Amino acid sequence: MNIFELLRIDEGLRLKIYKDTEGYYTIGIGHLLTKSPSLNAAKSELDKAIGRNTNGVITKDEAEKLFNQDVDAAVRGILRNAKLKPVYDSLDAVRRAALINMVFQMGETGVAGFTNSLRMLQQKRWDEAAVNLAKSRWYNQTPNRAKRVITTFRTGTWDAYKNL
Ligand SMILES: [Cl-]
Numbered sequence: 001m002n003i004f005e006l007l008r009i010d011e012g013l014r015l016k017i018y019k020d021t022e023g024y025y026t027i028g029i030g031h032l033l034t035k036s037p038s039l040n041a042a043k044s045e046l047d048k049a050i051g052r053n054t055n056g057v058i059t060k061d062e063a064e065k066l067f068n069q070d071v072d073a074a075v076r077g078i079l080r081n082a083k084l085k086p087v088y089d090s091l092d093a094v095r096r097a098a099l100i101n102m103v104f105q106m107g108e109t110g111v112a113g114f115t116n117s118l119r120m121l122q123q124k125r126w127d128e129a130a131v132n133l134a135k136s137r138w139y140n141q142t143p144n145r146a147k148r149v150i151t152t153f154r155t156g157t158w159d160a161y162k163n164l
C-alpha cells in the first residue's frame with residue numbers, strides 16, 4: 001500500500017464542496033478550502049485553486065491533481081520542519097507514511113506539537129508512543145482514523161487498512 005491509498009481511505013473522495021469533521025469547507029480528497037463560514041469564500045478559493053469557474057463542483061482528475069499537490073506539500077513540510085525531519089528520517093517506510101497522514105490531516109505545526117510522542121517514535125518505543133498519541137484531542141475527535149494511524153506506528157505494517 002502507499003500513502004495515496006492510505007489517505008484515500010481516510011479522507012474519501014467528494015466532487016462537490018462539503019464540510020469536514022470540523023465543519024470547514026473542503027473538496028476532493030480532504031482538500032481544505034477555507035476555515036471561513038462562507039460558502040462564497042469557499043467557492044472563490046475553489047476557483048482559484050482549479051483555475052476555472054467551477055461553481056463548487058470538480059472532476060475526478062482535478063481532485064487527483066489537488067491530491068498530488070497536497071501530498072507533496074505535506075512531505076515538504078516534514079522535510080522542512082526541524083522537529084519533524086529527524087523523526088521522519090529515523091523511521092522505516094511504513095511508519096513514514098503514518099507521519100505523512102497526520103501532517104496532511106493536521107498540519108505541520110499541529111503535528112510538531114506532539115513533542116513527547118515524536119521523541120518516543122524517534123526512540124522506537126512503539127507501545128509507549130501509541131499510548132501517548134492516544135492522549136490527544138485528535139484521538140478523541142477522530143478515533144477510528146487515529147487508531148488506524150496509531151496501529152500503523154505500533155506494528156510497522158498496513159494491517160489496520162488491509163481489510164478496509
Ligand atoms: Cl491550492
Ligand SMILES: [Cl-]
Nearest residue numbers: 142143144145
Ligand atoms: Cl475517525
